[PDB]
């Protein structure tokens, strides 16, 4: 009823956010349970840098972490302190003897990943910014980076029991069915004093074509 063709888009038309091969069917569960904690901690702990994504590879208890962020300057910080904190935190979270190497790379139109977009939209909603103006702020955040058409929805509660009053933004070419579309969909569950609110963003990295295979 409400589905986005992103599982088939990620993996055969694009890559995964956590990709790794293995020969056993038992450690896969342990690795998938272990790496999600690292990913979530890195996302929540570093929002001033707007960490776009983290790639995790796990082979034989060997964990390697790569980071892509919209504002990588805050990852390093002034006098290079935050970089040392990040390195030690990631080295310790993966194991005492687990190897770790990291490089800092940027992406064109850095604020094109729906994750940080939804996080900042929720922050604006709960940061003295009215819902319409928070919507506009999220729209500028995706747009001023250099991204294509925008879909923004905020569902849940208005501190009441009514379900027939809300606002939603659609602007531009966002085919929900095109596999080769480069669409990022993210959701945030924000805790308000009256419930949980879902902030969802569909952002186009670019209307991609002739690139339908994995890279």
């Amino acid at each position: 009823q409400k589905v986005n063709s992103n599982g088939l888009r990620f993996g055969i038309n694009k890559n995964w956010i956590s990709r790794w091969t293995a020969n056993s069917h038992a450690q896969t569960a342990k690795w998938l349970i272990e790496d999600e904690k690292i990913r979530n901690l890195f996302f929540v702990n570093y929002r001033n840098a707007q960490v776009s994504n983290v790639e995790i590879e796990r082979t034989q208890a060997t964990v390697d972490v790569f980071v892509y962020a919209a504002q990588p300057a805050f990852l390093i910080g002034s006098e290079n302190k935050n970089i040392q904190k990040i390195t030690k935190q990631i080295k310790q979270i993966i194991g005492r003897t687990t190897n770790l190497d990291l490089t800092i790379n940027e992406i064109g139109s850095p604020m094109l990943s729906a994750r940080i977009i939804a996080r900042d939209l929720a922050n604006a909603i709960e940061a003295r910014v009215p819902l319409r103006t928070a919507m506009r702020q999220s729209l500028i955040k995706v747009l001023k980076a250099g991204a294509n058409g925008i879909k923004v929805l905020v569902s849940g509660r208005l501190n009441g029991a009514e379900i027939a009053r809300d606002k939603m933004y659609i602007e531009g070419n966002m085919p929900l069915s095109t596999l080769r579309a480069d669409i990022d969909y993210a959701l945030e569950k924000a805790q308000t004093t009256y419930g949980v609110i879902g902030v969802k963003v569909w952002i186009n990295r670019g209307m991609i074509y002739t690139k339908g295979l994995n890279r």
Partner: protein, 153 residues
């Protein structure tokens, strides 16, 4: 131009499942030098509708002259079986009306009016009749030129 809203009301139609919850707005713009107009707009949020109706109204500016600080001549503006009276009210009472009619007169460049309403209390034909009556005032030189006698009358 002030671009002031005068009337908002939620208008809904029946479609394939559900109804059209949406509130429309209507703004009267003026400059108090004579120009005045009105414009309607539809939106699902307050500020968007406010701005759309502001620009729609500002697209319409109709100038009218000053007489006794009010309209040129007495006229009962009629529209949709709705009547609103407008008169060259002498400046001895001030603008005595509700906020809507006071604003409508003020953006018309007039200082005072004597109000009189005829018909239903629904507001959109009130606005239509008031605007029709206000805009249809006469001019001395125009009727002078039109008539066989042309000095001022």
């Amino acid at each position: 131009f002030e671009e002031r809203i005068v009337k908002l009301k939620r208008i809904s139609k029946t479609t394939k499942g559900g109804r059209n919850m949406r509130f429309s707005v209507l703004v009267v713009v003026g400059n108090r030098k004579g120009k005045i107009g009105y414009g309607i707009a539809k939106a699902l949020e307050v500020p968007n509708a406010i701005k759309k109706a502001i620009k729609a109204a500002h697209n319409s500016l109709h100038t009218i002259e000053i007489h006794k600080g009010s309209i040129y001549h007495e006229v009962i503006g009629r529209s949709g079986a709705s009547r609103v009276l407008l008169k060259p009210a002498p400046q001895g009472t001030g603008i005595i009306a509700g906020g809507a009619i006071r604003a409508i007169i003020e953006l018309a460049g007039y200082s005072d009016i004597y109000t009189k309403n005829l018909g239903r209390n629904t507001p959109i034909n009130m606005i239509h009749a008031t605007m029709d009556g206000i805009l249809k005032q006469l001019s001395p030189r125009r009727v002078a030129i039109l008539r066989n006698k042309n000095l001022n009358e």
